[PDB]
Amino acid sequence: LTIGNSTITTQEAANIIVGYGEWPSYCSVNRFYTLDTKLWEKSSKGWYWKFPDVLTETGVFGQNAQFHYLYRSGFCIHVQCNASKFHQGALLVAVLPEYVIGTVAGGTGTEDSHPPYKQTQPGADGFELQHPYVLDAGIPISQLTVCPHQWINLRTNNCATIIVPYINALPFDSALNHCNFGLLVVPISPLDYDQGATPVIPITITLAPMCSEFAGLRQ
Amino acid sequence: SHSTAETTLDSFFSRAGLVGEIDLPLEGTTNPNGYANWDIDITGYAQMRRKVELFTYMRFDAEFTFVACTPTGQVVPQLLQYMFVPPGAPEPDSRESLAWQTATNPSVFVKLSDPPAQVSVPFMSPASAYQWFYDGYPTFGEHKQEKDLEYGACPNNMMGTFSVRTVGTSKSKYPLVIRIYMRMKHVRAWIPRPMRNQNYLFKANPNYAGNFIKPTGASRTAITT
Amino acid sequence: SHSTAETTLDSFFSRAGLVGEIDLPLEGTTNPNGYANWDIDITGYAQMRRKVELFTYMRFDAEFTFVACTPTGQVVPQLLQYMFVPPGAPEPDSRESLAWQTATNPSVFVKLSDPPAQVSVPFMSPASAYQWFYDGYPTFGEHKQEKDLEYGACPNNMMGTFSVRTVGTSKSKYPLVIRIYMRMKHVRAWIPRPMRNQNYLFKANPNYAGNFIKPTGASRTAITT
Amino acid sequence: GFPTELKPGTNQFLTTDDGVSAPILPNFHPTPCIHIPGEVRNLLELCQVETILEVNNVPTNATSLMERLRFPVSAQAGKGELCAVFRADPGRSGPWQSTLLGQLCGYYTQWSGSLEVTFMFTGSFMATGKMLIAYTPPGGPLPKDRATAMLGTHVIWDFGLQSSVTLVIPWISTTGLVSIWYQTNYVVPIGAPNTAYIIALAAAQKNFTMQLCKDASDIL
Amino acid sequence: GFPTELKPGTNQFLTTDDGVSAPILPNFHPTPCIHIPGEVRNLLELCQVETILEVNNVPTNATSLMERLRFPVSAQAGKGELCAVFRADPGRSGPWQSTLLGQLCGYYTQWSGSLEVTFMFTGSFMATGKMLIAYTPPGGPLPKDRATAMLGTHVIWDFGLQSSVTLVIPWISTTGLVSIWYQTNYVVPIGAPNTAYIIALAAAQKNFTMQLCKDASDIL
Questions:
Q1: C-alpha span between B106 and A9 (Å, rounded)
Q2: Which top-rank group of organisms is this from (chain A) (predicted)?
Q3: E55/B222 Cβ within 8 A
Q4: Which residues, in sequence order, are CB contacts of C30 under 8 Å at separation 6+?
Q5: Is the dihedral of CA A87, A88, A94, A99 positive or negative?
Q6: CA D159 to the chain's CA centroid
Q7: Does A34 touch chain E if contact means CB atoms closer than 8 Å?
Q8: Which residues from chain D sit within 8 angstroms of residue A69, using beta carbons?
Q9: What is the DSSP code string of B102-169?
Q10: Assuming Cys at both sites, which of A15, C3, C24, D220 could form a disulfide with C46, CB separation 3.0 to 4.6 Å?
Q11: What residues of C are in contact with residue E28 (Cβ under 8 Å)?
């Protein structure tokens, strides 16, 4: 499962958390996806990601998933945050189903045309929340915990896992046509550290879907 | 509790209230053609709208009633029409339109002197459940660059249309004021969604404005009681 | 499908729509005698007509209703009459005709202030099933050269006649506008017939005109998408 | 008289009602029902019958309608595209409003299921050649040549069989495209006609059905 | 027709009525019901979910909302009072209208039952200290110091446990008060941050329920 010399050092003591006590379902695999490391700063406000459209560029099978229409898999999402024993900080990880991105309509006139392609495409790196209190969507940040989530504390843990099945708007679902979900990471208490210490906190997220489907049609 | 009937989701949604307000004056400019139309906009009223975003996937039916009254509240001998317009069917365009006599469009003859009549419509959504948020494009067509005629009225979300007309070649003699009420019998939701609390800017689009207010600011300081 | 009730032939014919339109103005020339008549012409409206030729042999019942209204749509204190005329019975000829008081002709006294009443007629055809096309002579008589009095109204196909009258020696004081609706309860067909698609020329005779149009011409060429 | 008050809305008159009325003739006896060889049950079995389909629509003259319903084939054209049937959507205008299936679906709003088509060839007994049937799924771009279409679900025509060639669409619900391409050149023996004409048939599968009625009428 | 006269008040129209109406479409067949992983039964289980609570409300700037939901702690303050959570009444304005429990109770008039809260600490791994949780019953005067509050039901915080500290209110139905006090000074090892921030969680117990609905709406 190595691409030449890709044998990373991984943790063996993950904290197993189940989602609703329900494992995923059948039709209605060992490749571990790797994303670029995220830097957490004192003034940082949190990030967000959109799947599966942005996911089709980081994964080895994700790159091929650009051409795959349907999905049939179970999601084991691993979020990893390594830090020293004398660092301070707190992070929240959660999944918001049907997470509609809130566009911002400023200016003197409160009216805008169809959403611009610049806002729709933040890239494969991810984007920053303009006003993270409302998740840039007018949705209060106080209420995220009703949805599945996990508490990450530097003094307590260094990793977490989330397992979620496929929930879609229709019994017959399209992954390349309908946006499924997204991940939200936001700091609650700003990170603090002593003067001269390491000011960058690494963040890595790992997921391992099973497989997708090609589909196809002709006239 | 033991008597939890009044606390269920049905009871949490069991209330008939104001939904529509359409006026048909004898003479004016709001409707100089003798008829009007109303689109079902539950999201129009922030009172009933704020309830639904508590969940994302939901199913509900409805029943509708009509009341005819003068500005003073008198009763006059005339009849008014009501019909449900499915998304496929075309809306009326004139008072003498051919759509009034269409057989496939259900319509009822009602005398307003009779105390108000009420009708209900069952589940018309082609999908399994309603979705108040469609994470994608408003149009279901294959084109993503033009201003399609199907924009705004997509078959996957729209739930019908109503029209009102006074039938009769002889001219109507009385002014009309019409009020509309609706209520649900069966309501069922699946997944909760965090509640929408901040101020709204548009009538049906969750876009918001840059002036930030907080829901509460009563408490001054932590030390203060 | 599993819920195929809405897709059956009954549902394919389950709709009440416009069938008849007869006006009785207070003064005019359309009916200067105070009464009118209506023959049941389902083939008159191409909407409902085009449905029936999909089959050749068919059986159907019907129910009928009446609505009385002013040109403005007001309600007035008067009564109107409706009676079914079997083919054997004679039609009324004058307002003071003796046919109104005939006992064998069923008639009903109705107040129009009462919300509209509806009546139904069962299977009156002497034959086993209706035939919209009679491959022969319109008359059932033994003569095939003259203009017989039975031409047009043959006992094998006609399904009745209605008449309208306002009873009372005192003169009527109000104008009348009358609208007629019909619907079927039991419908049953045996043999399909190819659908009639091209333009119609006559109101009840399938003869057509020499100017040929095609039902569709949207597609330009085979190579063109 | 008996103590009970009906809720308001007693005399509402809607067409959908399942109401029964007193007969105008309470003493007439209906004619006995007979057995007729013809019989109709639903709209599904009527959709299960085969009917012809049309492709070419170039000429419009009154004495020229017949060459519309069929499309020609010639040996000069080779390694290319002969005819491209329009987008697969029976309700809308295009190919299918000519046949019975689309017109009956015209009285309905939405439908779902699977569709199948069969093809018949009208060449000479001494003729031979190769033909290709191309189907592309919705969403995918337009086909370029025989190679691109061959990647997807395609049907290859053999002239060892007369009309055994048939296609089945697994699902239809923006619209799919089907086209015909020249896999090889058309070869004909000497002393035989140099061209032929092609016809096709279509029908509906078992799982095809409609959901909601529509008030649609065009003429008159 | 049948002899029975309904008592007066036949056509009264009240919203609460359990009336059933004739469908506008008597022939349509509804779409089949599917199974969805999400499912909702009542408002009680939705109250049984945990959500954050807020204490500090000094700053009001748009880019300054986050430090409201949490309150700071410093080693300089000792043997005193850090934060006093406002009066315990979820329906009214104060702490609880930010969380889900109070807002849903906002659609109701009166409620009864028991409430519980849990506390989480976000200090460094090398830090230690002692903390006190104070609850006073309604009616009783305001607390003066740690000694007066210690007489009643109090919870003592241990840093040998991370977030095992929790409080349960036996009954709530003018309003009770809860406060936080410094049992001992905050001591920190050298080379570690000199201050931290504190967050808390809240939820509803099994026996918590509402009785009567209220027509309450604020925006818009």
A1: 69
A2: Viruses
A3: yes
A4: C23, C36
A5: negative
A6: 25
A7: no
A8: 139
A9: -SSS-EEEEETTSPPPEEEE----SSSSEES--SS-S--SS-SSS--TTSS--TTT---EEEEE---S
A10: D220
A11: 6
Phi, psi (deg, nearest 5) at residue E150:
-65, -20
Instruction: Give the pairing type, strands D166-172 and D111-121.
Output: antiparallel
Residue with tokens 């840093």: E159
Cβ-proximal residues to E158 (8 Å cutoff; 6+ apart), any chain: E130, E165
Nearest to B56 among A97, A101, A137 (CB): A97
Do the Cβ atoms of A37 and A202 come closer than 8 Å? Answer: yes
Q: Which residue has the tokens 């707190």?
A: A90
Rounded-to-integer distance, Cα E178 and Cα E174, Å: 13
How much helix, strand and coil, in percent to the nearest 5, is found in chain C? Answer: 10, 30, 65
Contacts of E36 in chain B (CB under 8 A): 57, 129, 190-191
- Best mutation target, D2, D4, D5, to test chain E (most E CBs within 10 A): D5
Q: How far from D120 is each of D117, D148, D162, CA to CA, in Å?
A: 10, 25, 7
Helix (H) or strand (E) holding D196, with range, is strand D195-204
Q: Per residue in C65-100, is it b (16+ CB within 10 Å) or e — as a string? A: bbbbbbbbbbbeebebbbbbbbbeeeebeeeeeebb
Q: Provide the residue type at D152 as one letter.
A: G
Longest dimension (CA), chain E: 97
| Dist CA E168 CA D29 (whole Å) | 81
Method underlying the structure = cryo-EM
- Minimum Cα–Cα distance from E24: chain C residue: C15
Tell whether D211 is within 8 A of chain E (Cβ): yes
Sheet of strand C57-60, all strands in order from the earlier edge strand to the far edge: C130-131, C57-60, C187-189
Tell me the C-alpha distance between C61 and D101, whole Å.
28
The pair of three-digit structure tokens given for residue B165, joined into one six-digit string: 């007309």
* Among B47, B199, B218, beta carbon nearest to E93: B218
Distance of CA B32 to the CA centre of its chain: 23
3-state secondary structure of A144: helix
Vertex A48 angle, CA A46 and A53, to 5°: 160
Q: At how many Å resolution was this determined?
A: 5.9
The amino acid at residue B138 is P
Q: Is B125's Cβ below 8 Å from some Cβ in D? A: no
In the chain, the amino acid numbered B182 is M
